[PDB]
Structure formats: C-alpha cells, structure tokens
C-alpha cells in the first residue's frame, strides 16, 4: 500500500495429456487498463523491491479468493540481486495467510539483459527450490534466456518461447529445434511448457512431439481478475 | 575518415578430422603491443560504421601480407552499423586489391541484440552469403546469440561459446547439452565449431562427440600480427 495501484489477470496452463488445468500464470494489469507494460513502465529502480512483493501478495490473495486449487505461477522480476534470504519472508507469510501451499507456487525466471553471470540467478533458484517453490525458466530461446542457464542449474520447468512454437507444424527447422531441445529437457529432468500456442495445428504437433504443458490463446486469453475456462475444442475429446 | 589507429592479431581454427588448419580469426589489438577491449571502448555511435570497415580492411591486408592461404574469419560488430546492403563496397574492394578470395572470408555474427526486426540481421546474413562469404553465429549459448536466431536463418558454422565447453569431459549436463545441440546442428546442416578449448581432455571429448572444427589456447594463443602454428598433440589423438 504505497505509491500507485494495479491488479492481476490469470491465464491457464493446460495439461494436454490429462486435459486438466495445471495452473495459472499471474499477469500484471492496470486497475482497468489492460496492459502489463503500462504498469511495469511506471516502476523504477528505487521501488522495484516493494513492487515485486506487492505483485506476489496481490496474485496470491487474488488466486485464493478466486478459489485456485492448482499451481500459481508468478514472474520473478529481472532485477536479480539483493538478499534472497529475507525478501522471501513476505511471500511465505502471504501464502500462509491464504492457506496457499508454497509447493503450489512457481516462480518464472527471465532475463532481458546479461547480468551476474548465471551463478547469482542460480543462487536465487536453488534457494527457492530449498523452500519448496517450483521454478521455471521463462521465454527459453529468446533474450539471455538460453543454454547457458541450463548449463549450471536446472529448474523444474522450462517455458519455451512462442517464437520457437509459432507455426511449428509446418516449419522443419523449428521442428528440429524443438525435437532436440525436448530430448535435452528430458536428459536434464526438466518438464517442457510451450507458450504462445495460438492454433490447433501447433497444439497437435507439440502434443505429438511429447509436450504436455501448454499455454496460449488457443486455450484461453488472460482473464481480468478471473480464472478463464479453457477452450471446449480440446476439452471434449 | 576519422581518428585513432589499431592493428590485428590472429588465432587459428583447427580441423581435427583432417588435421588441417581451417583458418584464422582476426582479433582487434591496439598499436599498444597487445591491447584488447581498450580499442573497442573508443568506438561510439558516430563512428561504429567507420570503425567497422577499418577492421575488415586491416584484417584482409595483414592476412595477405602474412601469406594466409586458408580462411579469414572476421567479427561483424553487433550490427550497430545497420549496414545498408550496398556499403559492402569497402570489404569487396579490399579483398580484390589484396587478392584475397571472397569465399575464404567468414563473417561472425555475435550479439544480435533484441529481436533485431528479426529480418535485419537475417537480411544481412543472407546478403553476405549471396555474395559468396562464409557466415558464422558466434558465442552460441551465451548472449542474444541463441535458438531464436537459428530458427529463422542458418549460417555455415556455429561457434559454440566456451562456457558450454569448459571442462565438458567432466560435466554431464554440459555433455547432454552438446550431444543434443550437435544433433541439432547436424539436422540443420550446420558445422559446429568449439571455442575456448583449453585442455586435451576437452579436445578428446569434443572430438569423440563429432566436433571437427575447434579453437582455443590448447591449440594456439592469438599471435600479434602473426599466424601462430599449432600444437600437434592432437595429431592422432
Ligand atoms: Ca512469464
Ligand atoms: Ca568471434
């Protein structure tokens, strides 16, 4: 409760094998403004900390009040430094108030600039794992979110960037990339998640290739302060 | 036509299957008899184009003086130049004047920062190939040099970042990464090049995994204004 305000939207992650919802990603949106960027552009270096925790609190409280019984997935801000061994207390308390299991919370790690050289973000990830949080690398395949990360540590989940997913049913190069990356993920005991799935065509290929977790407009758009139901087109068969 | 001067150094790339030297990478050094990084800092937004051409010509003229008979590999600056596909005049004229065949010249595209309108770096890579140049993606697995690039265009060679290579004989995760990337490169008909090979142990493993082209201290250090000969330990190894 400080400077400016905002809320959350939620977007389903679907298990295409069980046809069940795995969970929802919490996405920042304005009080009525529907743009994530608009809000996050209003935050700066002097207030990144106190904003990051309000995201978590808001997302958890909103999750709980909406009746979320699966996983809650939250983006971890690229401003990766500070001491992890104290900023997590606010998060633990929040989960504890709303009786939301820490093991049902996943943090998504992303990078848009090359900082700290793996070993630091590694320390953040390994820490969260030791408290029982799930962990993910986000946007794998774009930005500084690539193979260098996987090399020194492994998250439970890797979310493959939509750029690698797009039109993959008829893109031989994207098919080879995904086929080999899925082998790599398996060797590393990492679960794949395909994001930005926009069409049945992509879905069916990714499902055949062995991907279970998917996210995207084909399933459901982010719902403002709500948990969207998933497209009956795939849930009926 | 602008300010400060500089020179070049050269480091050989070895082909371990044919036991032949593949060629040399040109590395920027100041007149200051071995000054790297210092030169590259002096470049700014106003002369990133004028400094770009200068490196290429110097590299070709020097290589020519030294009697280089194999490949000459040149780092394309992070496309801060935004080369209109017509200002390649300087390089073409330099190769012609110094009788250095254009097909023996390879350009290395490193940090393709941001989704460079995807096609920007793509157009430029495609344009250089159409002229007969060789092309390489540099530092694969470190910077913005990653899978997103490989998805939309393919170079002749991909230089794998030395971070993925370091102590790979010892590192089972790094091993799976390379085993699955080498299969990928092969699917895409791309020749891999292992950078930063420092020890025999690394060389033996990389060689046994199918890597032919390699570069690093193990073979030879960068030679100031010279073409370093290669440690023949890899002779039969
Ligand atoms: Ca995310
Ligand atoms: Ca290089």
**In degrees rounded to 5, what are phi and psi of residue A77?**
-60, 135
Residues A194, A199, A202, A204: is their CA dihedral positive or negative?
positive
Contact yes or no for A28/A8 (Cβ under 8 A): yes
Residues B193-232 as b or e (16 or more Cβ within 10 Å = b): bbbbbeeeebbebbbeeebbbbbbebbbebbeeebbebee
Element (H, E) at B12: strand B7-15
Q: What's the number of domains chain A is made of?
A: 1
Residues of A in contact with B179 (CB under 8 A): 187
Cβ within 8 Å, pair A141-B164: no
CA B170/CA B142 separation, integer angstroms = 20
CA A223/CA A9 separation, integer angstroms = 5
CA A132/CA A199 separation, integer angstroms = 34
Instruction: Name the packing angle between helices A200-209 and A172-187 (round to 10°).
Output: 40
Question: For residues A29, A30, A33 and A37, what is the CA-based torsion angle, rounded to 10 degrees?
Answer: -60
Tell whether A195 is in a known binding site: yes
Contact yes or no for A73/A108 (Cβ under 8 A): yes
Element (H, E) at A39: helix A36-40
Contact yes or no for A214/A13 (Cβ under 8 A): yes
**Cα–Cα distances in Å, from A162 out to A166, A178, B151?**
6, 12, 12
Q: Which among A114, A146, A190 is the top mutation candidate for probing chain B, defined by the most B β-carbons within 10 Å of its own β-carbon?
A: A146
**Cα–Cα distances in Å, from A154 out to A167, A192, B171, B219?**
28, 12, 14, 32
Contact yes or no for A195/A216 (Cβ under 8 A): yes
For residue B178, with 0-12 CB atoms within 10 Å meaning exposed, 13-18 middle and 19 or more buried, which class applies? Answer: buried
Within 8 A by CB and 6+ apart from A38, the residues are: A30
Question: For residues A223, A225, A227 and A230, what is the CA-based torsion angle, rounded to 10 degrees?
Answer: -10
CA B87/CA B217 separation, integer angstroms = 35
What is chain A's length? 237
Nearest to A26 by CA among A40, A48, A8: A8
Nearest to A227 by CA among A10, A70, A13, A43: A10
Domain that holds residue B225: 1-237
Q: How many CB atoms lie within 10 A of CB B68?
A: 20
Largest CA distance in chain A: 51
Residues B177, A205, A220, A236: is their CA dihedral positive or negative?
negative
Closest Cα in chain A to B187: A176
A residues 172-201 closer than 8 Å to B (CB) = 173-174, 176-177, 179-181, 183-184, 187-188
Cβ within 8 Å, pair A164-B142: no
Closest Cα in chain B to A177: B184
Q: How was this structure determined?
A: X-ray
For residue B6, what are its two tokens? Answer: 């500089």
Contact yes or no for B154/A169 (Cβ under 8 A): no
Q: Which among A148, A153, A160 is the top mutation candidate for probing chain B, defined by the most B β-carbons within 10 Å of its own β-carbon?
A: A148
Question: Collapsing DSSP states into helix, strand and coil, what is residue B69?
Answer: coil
Question: For residues B141, B145, B149 and B151, what is the CA-based torsion angle, rounded to 10 degrees?
Answer: 0
Tell whether A181 is in a known binding site: no
Nearest to A164 by CA among A143, A183, A178: A178
CA B193/CA B157 separation, integer angstroms = 7
For residue A163, what are its two tokens? Answer: 């750029």
Question: Collapsing DSSP states into helix, strand and coil, what is residue A15?
Answer: strand
E-state strands within A163-205: 191-194
Characterize the bridge pairing of strands A213-215 and A223-224: unpaired
CA B44/CA B198 separation, integer angstroms = 33
CA B162/CA B174 separation, integer angstroms = 11
For residue B142, what are its two tokens? Answer: 């470190």
How far is ligand 1, taken at its centre, from the CA of residue A126, in Å? 19
CA A82/CA B109 separation, integer angstroms = 34
Tokens 């998805």 sit at which residue?
B151
Contact yes or no for A13/A64 (Cβ under 8 A): no
Closest Cα in chain B to A117: B142
For residue A138, with 0-12 CB atoms within 10 Å meaning exposed, 13-18 middle and 19 or more buried, which class applies? Answer: buried
For residue B28, what are its two tokens? Answer: 């920027």
Characterize the bridge pairing of strands A105-109 and A134-140: parallel
Contact yes or no for A165/A141 (Cβ under 8 A): no
């Amino acid at each position: 409760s400080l400077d400016f305000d905002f809320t959350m939207a939620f977007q389903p992650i679907v298990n295409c094998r069980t046809k069940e919802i795995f969970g929802y990603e919490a996405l920042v949106r304005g009080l009525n403004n529907e743009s994530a960027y608009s809000v996050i552009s209003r935050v700066n270096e002097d207030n990144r900390y106190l904003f990051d925790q309000m995201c978590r609190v808001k997302a958890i409280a909103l999750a709980a009040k909406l009746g979320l019984t699966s996983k809650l997935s939250i983006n971890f801000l690229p401003n990766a430094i500070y001491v992890p061994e104290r900023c997590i207390r606010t998060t633990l308390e929040a989960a504890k108030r709303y009786q939301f299991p820490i093991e049902n919370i996943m943090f998504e790690f992303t990078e848009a600039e090359r900082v700290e050289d793996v070993n630091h973000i590694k320390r953040i990830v390994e820490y969260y794992k030791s408290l029982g949080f799930q962990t993910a690398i986000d946007d794998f395949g774009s930005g500084y979110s690539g193979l260098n990360l996987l090399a020194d540590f492994q998250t439970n989940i890797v979310k493959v960037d939509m750029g690698l997913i797009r039109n993959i049913h008829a893109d031989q190069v994207r098919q080879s990339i995904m086929k080999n990356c899925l082998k790599l993920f398996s060797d590393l005991n990492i679960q794949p998640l395909a994001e930005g799935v926009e069409s049945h065509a992509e879905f069916a290929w990714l499902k055949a290739a062995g991907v279970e977790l998917m996210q995207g407009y084909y399933f459901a758009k982010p719902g403002f302060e709500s948990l969207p139901s998933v497209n009956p087109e795939f849930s009926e068969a």
